[PDB]
């Protein structure tokens, strides 16, 4: 509601409570309010923002995929009487999903990307911009789709450029970015060769420097490396 007047620390505390209660829509709203206080986010706070919106859009994406499958199965069967209800409800869920993505992209543009001090946080936010354009691309059709795809690619490419100049190959943000850009290539851009090449290079270069990884980020980085491996197995 009137989050402008709320203490930033209270908004963060409420985000943490919402997380514990598995109330992700509330959690996201609290973190949006915290962002709008106009200060940079810490690591913990970036994680709260990410977890909240990823859970919200995650639910929407799952629902959309179910409905899209039903819609297509109905249309394939081609019965003179079925299909309009599922189309309309798929469109309703789609519109809600697009609204959440637009909210996230708005916060990135209005508050987060420009105002990041360091390379790590700048790359994190550009990755996030790539991700939410990618989620828009999943449901986009026609010409609008080409523009959305281009926006995702541009964001990911800028993030990749910075990460390669500024961050070690085993950094969790750099790894998560590379993983997601490879997914973009495979699932969105119909570019399996680039997906495989990026995933393979990322995996190998991370493994080559694994002996230098701090124990603090070891868990997260090795998890991403496993997902790179899993995708590579799926794609080949």
């Amino acid at each position: 509601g009137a989050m402008g007047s709320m203490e930033r620390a209270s908004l963060i505390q409420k985000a943490k409570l919402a997380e514990q209660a598995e109330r992700y829509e509330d959690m996201a709203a609290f973190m949006k309010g915290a962002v709008e206080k106009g200060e940079e986010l810490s690591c913990e706070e970036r994680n709260l923002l990410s977890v909240a919106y990823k859970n919200v859009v995650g639910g929407q994406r799952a629902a959309w995929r179910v409905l899209s499958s039903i819609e297509q199965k109905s249309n394939e069967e081609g019965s003179e009487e079925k299909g309009p209800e599922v189309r309309e409800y798929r469109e309703k869920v789609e519109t809600e999903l697009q609204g959440v993505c637009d909210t996230v992209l708005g916060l990135l543009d209005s508050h987060l990307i420009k105002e990041a001090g360091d390379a790590e946080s700048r790359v994190f936010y550009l990755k996030m911009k790539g991700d939410y354009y990618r989620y828009l691309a999943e449901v986009a059709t026609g010409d609008d789709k080409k523009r959305i795809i281009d926006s995702a690619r541009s964001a990911y490419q800028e993030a990749m450029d910075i990460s390669k100049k500024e961050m070690p190959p085993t950094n969790p943000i750099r790894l998560g970015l590379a993983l997601n850009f490879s997914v973009f290539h495979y699932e969105i851009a119909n570019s399996p060769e680039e997906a495989i090449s990026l995933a393979k290079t990322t995996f190998d270069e991370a493994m080559a420097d694994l002996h230098t990884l701090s124990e603090d980020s070891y868990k997260d980085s090795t998890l991403i490396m496993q997902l790179l491996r899993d995708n590579l197995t799926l794609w080949t």
Binding site: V183, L223, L227, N231, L234
Partner: peptide
């Protein structure tokens, strides 16, 4: 049978 992207942590 979709590709895996980065998960939520912590």
């Amino acid at each position: 049978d979709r590709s895996s992207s980065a998960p939520n942590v912590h």
